[PDB]
Amino acid sequence: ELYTKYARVWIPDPEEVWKSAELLKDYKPGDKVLQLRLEEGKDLEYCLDPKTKELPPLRNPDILVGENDLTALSYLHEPAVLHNLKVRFIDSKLIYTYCGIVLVAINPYEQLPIYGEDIINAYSGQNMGDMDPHIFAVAEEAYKQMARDERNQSIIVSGESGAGKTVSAKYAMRYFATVSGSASEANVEEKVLASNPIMESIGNAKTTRNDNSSRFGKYIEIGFDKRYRIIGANMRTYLLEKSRVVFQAEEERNYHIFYQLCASAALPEFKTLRLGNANYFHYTKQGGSPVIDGIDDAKEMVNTRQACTLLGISDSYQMGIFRILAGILHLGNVEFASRDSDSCAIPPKHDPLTIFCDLMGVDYEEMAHWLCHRKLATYIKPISKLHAINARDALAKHIYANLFNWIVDHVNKALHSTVKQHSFIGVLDIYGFETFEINSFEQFCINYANEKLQQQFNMHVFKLEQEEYMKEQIPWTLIDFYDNQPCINLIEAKMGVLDLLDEECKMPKGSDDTWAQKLYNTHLNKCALFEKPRLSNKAFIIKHFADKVEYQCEGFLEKNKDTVYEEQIKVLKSSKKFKLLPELFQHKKTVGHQFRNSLHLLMETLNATTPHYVRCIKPNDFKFPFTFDEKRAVQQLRACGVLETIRISAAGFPSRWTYQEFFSRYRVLMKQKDVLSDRKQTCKNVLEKLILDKDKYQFGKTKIFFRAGQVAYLEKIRADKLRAACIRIQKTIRGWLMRKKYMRMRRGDA
Amino acid sequence: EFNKDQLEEFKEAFELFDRVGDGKILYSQCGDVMRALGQNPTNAEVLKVLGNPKSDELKSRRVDFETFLPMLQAVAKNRTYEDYLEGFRVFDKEGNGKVMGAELRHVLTTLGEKMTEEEVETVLAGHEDSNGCINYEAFLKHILS
Numbered sequence: 087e088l089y090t091k092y093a094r095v096w097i098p099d100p101e102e103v104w105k106s107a108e109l110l111k112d113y114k115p116g117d118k119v120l121q122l123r124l125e126e127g128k129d130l131e132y133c134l135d136p137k138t139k140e141l142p143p144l145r146n147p148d149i150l151v152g153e154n155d156l157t158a159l160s161y162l163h164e165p166a167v168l169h170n171l172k173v174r175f176i177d178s179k180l181i182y183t184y185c186g187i188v189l190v191a192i193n194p195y196e197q198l199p200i201y202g203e204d205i206i207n208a209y210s211g212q213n214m215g216d217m218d219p220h221i222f223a224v225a226e227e228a229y230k231q232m233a234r235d236e237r238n239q240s241i242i243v244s245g246e247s248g249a250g251k252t253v254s255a256k257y258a259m260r261y262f263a264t265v266s267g268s269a270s271e272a273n274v275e276e277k278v279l280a281s282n283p284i285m286e287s288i289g290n291a292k293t294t295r296n297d298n299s300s301r302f303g304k305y306i307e308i309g310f311d312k313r314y315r316i317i318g319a320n321m322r323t324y325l326l327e328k329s330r331v332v333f334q335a336e337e338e339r340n341y342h343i344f345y346q347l348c349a350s351a352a353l354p355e356f357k358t359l360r361l362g363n364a365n366y367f368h369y370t371k372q373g374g375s376p377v378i379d380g381i382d383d384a385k386e387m388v389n390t391r392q393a394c395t396l397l398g399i400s401d402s403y404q405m406g407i408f409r410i411l412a413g414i415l416h417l418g419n420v421e422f423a424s425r426d427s428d429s430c431a432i433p434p435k436h437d438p439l440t441i442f443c444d445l446m447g448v449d450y451e452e453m454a455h456w457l458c459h460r461k462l463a464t465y466i467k468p469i470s471k472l473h474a475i476n477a478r479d480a481l482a483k484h485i486y487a488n489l490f491n492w493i494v495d496h497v498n499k500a501l502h503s504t505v506k507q508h509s510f511i512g513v514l515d516i517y518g519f520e521t522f523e524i525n526s527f528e529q530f531c532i533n534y535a536n537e538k539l540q541q542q543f544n545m546h547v548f549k550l551e552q553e554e555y556m557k558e559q560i561p562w563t564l565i566d567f568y569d570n571q572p573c574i575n576l577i578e579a580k581m582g583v584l585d586l587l588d589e590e591c592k593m594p595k596g597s598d599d600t601w602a603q604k605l606y607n608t609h610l611n612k613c614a615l616f617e618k619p620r621l622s623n624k625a626f627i628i629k630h631f632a633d634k635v636e637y638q639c640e641g642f643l644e645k646n647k648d649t650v651y652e653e654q655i656k657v658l659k660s661s662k663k664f665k666l667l668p669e670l671f672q673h674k675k676t677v678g679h680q681f682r683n684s685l686h687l688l689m690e691t692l693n694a695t696t697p698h699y700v701r702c703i704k705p706n707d708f709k710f711p712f713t714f715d716e717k718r719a720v721q722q723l724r725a726c727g728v729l730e731t732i733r734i735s736a737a738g739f740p741s742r743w744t745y746q747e748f749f750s751r752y753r754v755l756m757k758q759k760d761v762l763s764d765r766k767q768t769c770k771n772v773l774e775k776l777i778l779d780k781d782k783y784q785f786g787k788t789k790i791f792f793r794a795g796q797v798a799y800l801e802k803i804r805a806d807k808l809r810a811a812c813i814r815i816q817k818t819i820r821g822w823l824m825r826k827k828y829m830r831m832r833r834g835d836a
Numbered sequence: 837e838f839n840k841d842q843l844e845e846f847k848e849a850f851e852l853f854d855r856v857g858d859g860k861i862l863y864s865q866c867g868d869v870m871r872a873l874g875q876n877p878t879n880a881e882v883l884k885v886l887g888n889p890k891s892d893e894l895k896s897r898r899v900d901f902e903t904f905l906p907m908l909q910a911v912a913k914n915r916t917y918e919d920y921l922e923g924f925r926v927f928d929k930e931g932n933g934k935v936m937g938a939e940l941r942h943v944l945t946t947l948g949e950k951m952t953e954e955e956v957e958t959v960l961a962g963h964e965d966s967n968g969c970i971n972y973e974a975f976l977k978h979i980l981s
């Protein structure tokens with residue numbers, strides 16, 4: 087059939103994930119082994135797994151390889167995408183490629199001359215599909231659809247940390263700035279980009295896999311007037327990792343700003359703050375990773391403070407922030423000592439607490455009282471040791487969340503426009519599927535968000551397919567929608583994973599182990615998106631969009647608790663030495679429920695727009711210039727929806743030629759008589775003869791829609807012809823010239 | 837098959853290809869001879885008759901006329917004209933018999949049993965005008981004789 091001699095395939099390879107091979111002999115049906123040839127010649131007999139009898143994936147013919155859009159490819163499968171993106175990247179320095187409505191951006195780790203003014207103009211006023219893919223092309227489409235529909239735009243930039251999401255945004259702005267009119271004293275771009283050091287200090291952290299990871303969603307809204315011109319911006323934050331403020335796991339730090347504070351401790355202006363090094367404070371020591379190789383946390387502070395200066399946080403208020411963060415840090419070290427009748431108390435004249443109360447300006451004794459006591463409403467009651475600690479962390483977390491919101495509100499003031507705003511284009515800078523070896527609550531949250539976002543995207547694509555299918559008059563009921571609501575529901579419905587977790591939390595005796603069993607009782611077997619490790623009773627598995635993810639129940643309950651004692655907040659609200667500390671503040675709250683809230687808030691915002699998609703990708707793990715690791719790449723695609731999106735696409739009719747295009751490349755397959763005066767009609771006649779099964783394509787107003795592998799087949803028979811025609815002429819010339827060589831040597835010419 | 841007069845005409849041609857003085861030739865040379873004697877085998881057709889020899893023996897195994905002869909026979913008993921004209925009709929994007937020079941060299945040097953550019957040069961020597969066009973019909977008859 088299609089696996090003939092000389093046709094090539096991709097087989098697995100420990101080094102490069104996939105490796106090319108050629109068939110030495112035609113694959114005969116029922117055969118057990120193929121006969122293949124590798125990168126060093128003919129050597130190997132590939133064994134077919136007896137249980138599936140399945141064959142290795144096929145390679146696309148060269149004329150389809152290197153294209154601007156992956157869906158152009160006939161055999162659309164993991165190696166095909168992986169190869170095709172490799173050759174563009176490595177052999178043509180091309181970092182941008184489309185996957186349908188998606189723009190894939192591979193981090194080059196080398197500055198390129200493709201971002202200057204000349205190139206901006208060239209994309210200005212063109213159609214997306216008539217210009218080489220670029221972040222600029224995605225910008226232009228947004229600015230276009232804006233007016234053409236009186237509709238705000240969201241550009242959604244996703245990818246692992248360090249894939250270049252931040253850089254992609256930075257250039258989508260510049261476009262929008264340059265192609266609008268420009269504002270004088272605004273030059274909005276510059277102000278916003280100065281915001282970055284701030285947001286990165288309070289919102290980014292070192293993790294086990296990344297030195298500078300954003301543990302939140304940033305959404306910069308770009309504001310536009312009635313005459314479509316850049317006037318101002320508006321930052322919106324979401325999905326913040328509150329847990330990280332009081333817990334770290336091995337080789338991970340708390341948010342940067344804390345470390346840019348300890349390293350700046352022996353400085354004069356920061357002596358009231360009274361800070362040791364990072365091993366001192368509980369809320370910065372837990373990971374064991376105090377310093378990031380190649381960063382002077384102190385010089386980053388200098389830059390941090392400088393950026394605050396640029397956005398108009400008055401030096402006074404700057405000390406306002408650092409002071410609150412010092413206290414959170416001292417707060418952390420407040421130790422509790424258990425006393426009679428399951429209660430506690432703070433050791434006499436406690437160094438940490440004294441410094442906490444001094445900085446905040448509140449009565450030592452009023453606070454010490456309320457750290458260990460609770461208002462059961464109106465009888466005072468003691469709290470156990472563990473409840474005091476949960477509540478201390480609840481307060482550390484609460485404060486941070488507010489101080490974080492405060493900074494965003496006042497960064498905003500510097501990015502706000504007096505001029506009224508007609509419309510906006512907002513760029514979302516968010517994460518994608520996280521998946522370490524050990525997965526916890528933090529990851530669970532992230533991939534939950536990503537299931538919300540990949541649902542909007544799924545829908546969007548489905549509506550655009552319909553529209554396109556109608557424009558060409560093709561039965562609109564040939565588009566199977568893949569619905570990821572069951573998974574969302576497993577996570578966020580009642581009796582779901584976050585709900586059971588929120589129940590087990592308000593149980594006094596509750597634990598991770600009982601929550602694990604409640605998940606099994608409720609879900610194991612009743613639902614196919616949920617599984618259980620065979621040799622654990624402390625871990626579950628969810629089958630998310632892209633892949634399966636084994637979470638580990640250890641830690642879930644404590645991370646998820648976030649109940650702040652009303653009394654402890656009042657003590658802080660009632661301050662008279664600190665203008666900022668009151669300014670922050672205006673059954674049983676929980677990190678998970680909170681996360682959920684922010685999540686829904688975000689999907690609203692985003693559903694009141696038409697979204698655009700840029701998937702960023704890190705190709706290698708050592709910041710190397712144009713270097714493509716196949717192992718990293720393939721990881722990065724999976725946890726990016728890409729390969730799955732494509733998995734869906736290849737189910738329908740992903741190939742799409744116009745009758746003119748088909749006709750050109752395939753005039754040569756046609757018998758001279760078959761050709762007609764009506765070229766459209768001609769194609770209809772030829773393609774029904776060359777490819778039989780009529781379920782393998784559909785005929786539209788201006789285009790033929792092909793099933794996967796079909797154009798490949800056209801290009802095989804077209805190849806078979808021209809090959810058999812050449813071998814003919816060749817063997818002839820080989821003979822003509824051998825006899826000419828004879829006739830000479832016959833008459834002693836040597 | 838073959839008679840005595842034909843065996844002498846063939847053995848005369850065969851000893852011209854002996855560049856050593858042992859009465860034998862290299863396995864690789866077997867292809868040359870057959871073409872010299874009016875045949876036109878595809879390099880594959882040649883290899884089958886040799887035994888599909890591995891490269892280690894394709895440059896070292898010698899053969900007398902006795903052993904060469906069955907191979908010369910084998911190619912004999914497996915070798916139209918119209919289908920040659922239809923094959924050039926493939927590469928013709930006009931209908932006028934006139935085919936590009938660049939596009940003929942290209943296909944002949946990057947397809948099927950690929951030929952060297954030098955071989956492709958000596959053959960199409962002068963059979964092309966200023967526009968880089970060549971009436972295949974003229975070319976097709978030439979190469980056959």
Ligand SMILES: Nc1ncnc2c1ncn2[C@@H]1O[C@H](COP(=O)(O)OP(=O)(O)O)[C@@H](O)[C@H]1O
Binds near residue numbers: 193194245247253
């Ligand atoms: N298009 C690009 N051209 C040149 N360098 C880039 C490009 N994209 C990313 N980089 C490099 O990659 C690094 C990480 O960029 P960044 O946008 O901060 O990733 P992210 O913000 O998602 O974490 C940058 O320091 C930059 O050096």
